[PDB]
């Protein structure tokens, strides 16, 4: 594949744009307003400038990557792309509208993928006449840096679609893993209940925040403690993922702690609000 | 403190002897047979030789460290130790017997600590007349290298006993964290259920073994994948810990997968048997 269309110019969409462009794909990024598209382009540009200051890439590299990326508000520009990656809002009614629309717009060959963490690819696929070509392609923040892509097969995703996405991931220097669609896939199903267990430990007076996090770093060689990780991911995101696991499975194993729900209610969402488990600033 | 008594000359007990002796403590290591004791000292000697191999210590350091260590099969040699670290079998009736005996032998000041992962410090303490001086001092394999010590306070453990163990930890170069006794303390409570979650993901056809492990390493920056980690820790030990968490809490959240139970029943315990989730060799 050579031409990729990414919907959404928020943080993840822009990061995924960069992941593809950095390895020589031609990428079109679409959002709903012209200043959203611009915001995402400036997001990629700052991120490349950081890469230059670190002497990871040259200033020429920066401009070359930028040269492969174009913004638009026009969905009809997907028509000729080989892959679409949707990174827009985590809402099933809207995803089904988006994918139905893309199904109408795009050549038969085009594979339609979602970066969704929490909605069913199978259900989204069912809103198209191309279920065999609908698939999850789940990146991790920061998408240019994190090597994993979870390639999530819906019930109807064909082997051919899976192979092509596996191939594409490898072409952009990523490691794809095959996931049969289930709640949380692999990474979040393991990781978010880890953070949630850390909140239970806190709520039950077992240890204090800094001690929980130093335990996991120094006892398990984790790169970050789970409370700090939660503040990085966003406690709202963590809470939402635990609620999804619980709703999907019906299994009280995945019940969020009350303390986590209280923090989210306070708007103590972690780094992005300046306060979660820890107090940050700006 | 100058003198430490360690029960158990297997791999943990030997690592712990080494962690104390390398930092200037006299250590007496006790096990129920002389070849066990001999194997422990053999282990420590290997490890130090390899430190010498890699030029992190001189061969004179090595000798000086070994000359601080003596072996025995007689519990009565604990009498003059300032601290006892019990790293012996994970059975309550027998822990209680060890601690009751140690209580009769040791001078009044000796702190009696257990390296237990899975039994109650409180319940052990209650078999002594010195519950104020009974505590958990929980090291991580390899004890010479891993910085964390979980310092587990039983219901009756005094502040003075806690502070002394905190200071001892810092004196041997470790980072202590305060834990109020509860199932799995901090580390294992978070870590082992992650491993068990990987085994469910495997059991449920979600992804295969290597993809599960690549996901956690490349998606969450973990130093090892959870299944490989289970093989390192030992699947028997993983299952035991999930069973303690479940039996202690009555919470189905901590139920072991059937798949984990079956591997343990097969003797596919991990690296130590040449086969767990993966096959090993030589």
UniProtKB/TrEMBL annotation, chains A, B:
Amino acids binding CoA? 47, 54, 117
Task: Write one Pfam family the protein is assigned to.
Answer: 3HCDH
Q: Which domain of life is it from?
A: Bacteria
The UniProt entry's coiled-coil ranges are none
| Keywords recorded for this protein, A-Z | NAD, Nucleotide-binding, Oxidoreductase
Q: Where is the 3-hydroxyacyl-CoA dehydrogenase NAD binding domain?
A: 3-181
| Similarity section | Belongs to the 3-hydroxyacyl-CoA dehydrogenase family.
InterPro entries linked: 3-OHacyl-CoA_DH, 3-OHacyl-CoA_DH_CS, 3-OHacyl-CoA_DH_NAD-bd, 3HC_DH_C, 6-PGluconate_DH-like_C_sf, 6PGD_dom2, NAD(P)-bd_dom_sf
* Positions of the 3-hydroxyacyl-CoA dehydrogenase C-terminal domain: 184-280
Name recorded for this polypeptide: 3-hydroxybutyryl-CoA dehydrogenase
Check the UniProt entry and state the signal peptide residues, or none.
none
Q: In which pathway does it act?
A: Lipid metabolism; butanoate metabolism
GO MF term list: 3-hydroxybutyryl-CoA dehydrogenase activity; NAD+ binding
Site Important for catalytic activity: give positions: 138
Binding locations of NAD(+): 8-13, 30-31, 90, 95, 115, 117, 141, 272
GO aspect biological process, one term: butyrate metabolic process
């Amino acid at each position: 594949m050579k031409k990729v269309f990414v919907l959404g110019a928020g943080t993840m969409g822009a990061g995924i744009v960069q992941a593809f462009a950095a390895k020589g794909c031609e990428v079109i990024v679409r959002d709903i307003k012209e200043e959203f598209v611009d915001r995402g382009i400036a997001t990629i540009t700052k991120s490349l400038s950081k890469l230059v200051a670190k002497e990871k890439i040259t200033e020429a590299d920066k401009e070359e990557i930028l040269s492969r990326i174009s913004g638009t508000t026009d969905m009809k520009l997907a028509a000729d792309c080989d892959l679409v990656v949707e990174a827009a809002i985590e809402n099933m009614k809207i995803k089904k509208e988006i994918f139905a629309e893309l199904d109408g717009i795009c050549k038969p060959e085009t594979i339609l993928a979602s970066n969704t963490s929490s909605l069913s690819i199978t259900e989204v696929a069912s809103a198209t006449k191309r279920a065999d070509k609908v698939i999850g392609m789940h990146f991790f923040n920061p998408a240019p840096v994190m090597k994993l892509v979870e390639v999530i097969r819906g019930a109807a995703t064909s082997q051919e679609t899976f192979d092509a996405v596996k191939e594409m991931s490898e072409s952009i220097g990523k490691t794809p893993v095959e996931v049969a669609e289930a709640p949380g896939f692999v990474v979040n199903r393991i990781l978010i209940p880890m953070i949630n267990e850390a909140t239970f430990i806190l709520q039950e007076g077992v240890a204090k925040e800094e001690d929980i996090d130093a335990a996991m770093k120094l006892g398990a060689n984790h790169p970050m403690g789970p409370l700090a990780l939660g503040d990085l991911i966003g406690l709202d995101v963590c809470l939402a993922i635990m609620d999804v696991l619980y709703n999907e499975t019906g299994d009280t194993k995945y019940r969020a702690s009350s303390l986590l729900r209280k923090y989210v209610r306070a708007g103590w969402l972690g780094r992005k609000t300046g306060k979660g488990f820890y107090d940050y600033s700006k």
